[PDB]
Amino acid sequence: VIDPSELTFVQEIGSGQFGLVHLGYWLNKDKVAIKTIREGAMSEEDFIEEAEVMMKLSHPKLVQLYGVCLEQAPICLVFEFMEHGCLSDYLRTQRGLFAAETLLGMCLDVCEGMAYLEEACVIHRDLAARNCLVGENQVIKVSDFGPVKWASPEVFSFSRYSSKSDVWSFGVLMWEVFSEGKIPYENRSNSEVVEDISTGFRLYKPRLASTHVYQIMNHCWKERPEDRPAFSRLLRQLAEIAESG
C-alpha cells in the first residue's frame, strides 16, 4: 500500500537520525504521523525490509501504519496519529492525576502488544515509555518497533537480545509508568548502574505501585532470562492483579 505524496506536512514532532517525524494529513482527511529517513541513514533495503515486517504485524496495542512513500523524496512511513503523544511525555505532565487503576491499565496495554510481538518472534530492542504512544482515551500502543537503564544483564554484557530482554525492559517501563514518568536510576552512571544491578539492586517501588505490581516488576528483573515470565504470562498475571488488585 504505497503512498505517492498525497501527504501534507504540518509540524515536526519527533526525531533521531533515521529521520524526523512530522504531523501530517493523508488526503486532507486522515491525521497521520510521517516518519522520514534522512539521506544515508538507512539502506533502501533496510527501510524496505523494515516496512514490510512492520506492515506484517498488527495488534490493537501497536501503532497502525497507513502506508509507505517509496515514491521518492525523503522515504517515509505513514503511521496513524496518536492524539496524546508519547506516554513518557504524558506521564510526566498529568503527574498526580493518575489512579493506580489507570496506570496498570497502561501497563496491560503494552503487555498485550508485547505478548503479540513475542509470539510473532519479534524483539523490541528498546521498550521504554518514550516509545509508547497514547491515543484514543488512555489507550497505550507500543511503536518504534520493527539505553542501559532498560537493558537486561545479557544485553549489558553479551548484547544478547531476546523476548526476555524485552520483559526486563518492560519491567523498567512499568516502573516508569507507576512512578508517573520518572527517570530510572537518574542520579547514576551507566558504568555504575551495571554495578548496582549486578549485585542485586533493583529500582525502588513507586508509591502508586502496590506490592503485587512490584512483585511482577521484580520478576521481569530476575537475573536469568529463563527466570522471567514470558509476556504471554505477564499479561495474565497483570490481569489478575488488575481484576482484583
Swiss-Prot record:
GO biological process: adaptive immune response; B cell receptor signaling pathway; cellular defense response; gamma-delta T cell activation; intracellular signal transduction; NK T cell differentiation; positive regulation of cytokine production; signal transduction
Expression across tissues: T-cell lines and natural killer cell lines.
Main localization of the protein described in the UniProt heading: cytoplasm
Keyword list, A-Z: Adaptive immunity, ATP-binding, Cytoplasm, Disease variant, Immunity, Kinase, Metal-binding, Nucleotide-binding, Nucleus, Phosphoprotein, SH2 domain, SH3 domain, Transferase, Tyrosine-protein kinase, Ubl conjugation, Zinc, Zinc-finger
Superkingdom in the source lineage: Eukaryota
Disulfide-bond pairs as recorded: none
Subcellular localization, as worded in the UniProt entry: Cytoplasm; Nucleus
One example GO MF annotation: ATP binding
Induction comment from the UniProt entry of this chain: Through a myriad of surface receptors including the TCR/CD3 signaling complex, coreceptors, or chemokine receptors.
Coiled coil: none
Keyword Nucleotide-binding: yes
Subunit and interaction comment: Homooligomerizes; this association negatively regulates kinase activity. Interacts with PPIA/CYPA; this interaction regulates TCR signal strength via a proline-directed conformational switch in ITK. Interacts with THEMIS. Interacts with FASLG. Interacts with VAV1; this interaction is important for VAV1 localization and TCR-induced actin polarization. Interacts with TBX21.
Family the UniProt entry places it in: Belongs to the protein kinase superfamily. Tyr protein kinase family. TEC subfamily.
Disease as annotated in the protein's UniProt record: Lymphoproliferative syndrome 1: A rare immunodeficiency characterized by extreme susceptibility to infection with Epstein-Barr virus (EBV). Inadequate immune response to EBV can have a fatal outcome. Clinical features include splenomegaly, lymphadenopathy, anemia, thrombocytopenia, pancytopenia, recurrent infections. There is an increased risk for lymphoma.
Domain notes: The N-terminal PH domain allows ITK to be recruited to the plasma membrane by an activated PI3 kinase. This domain also contains a proline-rich region (PRR). The adjoining domain is a SH3 domain, which binds to PRR (from itself or from other proteins). Next, a SH2 domain is required for binding tyrosine-phosphorylated substrates. In the C-terminal region, the kinase domain is required for tyrosine phosphorylation.
Protein name: Tyrosine-protein kinase ITK/TSK
Section covered of the full-length record: 357 to 619 of 620
